Amino acid sequence: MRKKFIIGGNWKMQILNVEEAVSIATELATTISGILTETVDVFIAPSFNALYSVGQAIKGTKLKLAGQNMYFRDKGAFTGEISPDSLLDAGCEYVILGHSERRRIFGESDAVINQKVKKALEKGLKPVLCIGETAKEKEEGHTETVLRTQIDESMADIPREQLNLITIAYEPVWAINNKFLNPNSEIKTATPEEAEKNHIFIRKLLINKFGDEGKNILIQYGGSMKASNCEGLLNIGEINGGLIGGASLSAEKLKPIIEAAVKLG
Amino acid sequence: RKKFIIGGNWKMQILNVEEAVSIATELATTISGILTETVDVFIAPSFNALYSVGQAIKGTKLKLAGQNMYFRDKGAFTGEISPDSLLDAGCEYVILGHSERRRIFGESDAVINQKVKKALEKGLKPVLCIGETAKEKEEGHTETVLRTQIDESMADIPREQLNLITIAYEPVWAINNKFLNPNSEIKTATPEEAEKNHIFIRKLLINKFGDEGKNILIQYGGSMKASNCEGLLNIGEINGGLIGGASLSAEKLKPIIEAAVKLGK
Structure with a gap:
């Protein structure tokens, strides 16, 4: 009956050398070992060059x-x-x-x-x-149309018996301060209120398409999540984790997020 | 003494790090006994294997x-x-x-x-x-396409870095793939076609870069295997090969390397 969370760390193209990736990954695996994470899964996504060495280093730990x-x-x-x-x-x-x-x-x-x-x-x-x-x-009023299109077409023809392996991450791309992504528009603040709205909408779509199997798909928040705001976001009902950017690049930055998820489970 | 660069593009053909390391080790041993003073050989494994392969072949002649x-x-x-x-x-x-x-x-x-x-x-x-x-x-646009690619891909390169560049000409038109070549007859590439395109590329490089452009080696990037490598490497403005399938084993690649060495005496 306790709330489940997946905390995912997307290292993007921020960690360049294998030695550093392994060092960070090992430090994170050491840090989370003691945290009581029965209800919380934690993964990191290093760049391709480091995957094999990192996987070797954290084999047998709780870090995925x-x-x-x-x-x-x-x-x-x-x-x-x-x-x-x-x-x-x-x-x-x-x-x-x-x-x-x-x-x-x-x-x-x-x-x-x-x-x-x-x-x-x-x-x-x-x-x-x-x-x-x-x-x-x-x-331009296309939030609902875009998210429906992306769900319908990215999850087209998925065997229902495989649905329980899927996690959705919602990215409020509209809030990224990047004129490449958002060339000719105001860049608004990603509020927890907006995040709740979008996550509830996604849940309803997943229920409509997939019924009961759809209620079980965890939706990570993929906006900016850090120590200072993670508890407010992770406490929102239809937010069941975070896909974390800059705050996943060290155990010091990521630990408070994992702690918040554990407290709420 | 004619110089050659023989490059193996493993594409997405070798999946496991152990296989990539075994092949690379075998190839480094194979070429150690070949006198390759004017022939540089490299392999391009997929990102996941680069670090481990680099470890395995450190200090050999295999780049x-x-x-x-x-x-x-x-x-x-x-x-x-x-x-x-x-x-x-x-x-x-x-x-x-x-x-x-x-x-x-x-x-x-x-x-x-x-x-x-x-x-x-x-x-x-x-x-x-x-x-x-x-x-x-x-449609008669071979020259316009290659010139556009050369002009725009090489824009603003400092003349003093130009000696580090290798060009590889790919006869994409000869690739038996309807996705690449949907609504055209697919013809098999010939050495005479290869020579024509390589000479044109040489002319463009000299026109743009003067003497520095004469020095840029041009690899043939069409299908090169033991059975046809000597004829191709033998062409004046072909100074190597960017090799696909035949670079996936030492047995398949060695006769190409041996042909380049024979032609580089």
């Missing part, structure tokens, strides 16, 4: 490993792409898919992301499927 | 390459790999603008241009790939 992306085929002539099998080889248990940077900077479509989600489930990877609308989309 | 990278050192780029991560793994080369990146994953010349300049700033040797599709070739 994720890829930041993957291709939707197992092997072939895809220069620069990473196979789901390579994630598994490194010990990954999760994979982030459809992150707003993949969608909006690198042009990954819902159809491409849908293929990757289905592949991850086939491979036994737990996909963290990210969705979210830009400032122009929100200001 | 290491990345298949791609981003054009910033660090930042919020989920799924991207920094040039610093390539350097951390021991990479000396990086493949940039490979046809799969351009044509499947939509990398523009402006993006590839930033990657090339970044690679040079970092001291990496870029292998800049160019090439036209079957539609472009059939």
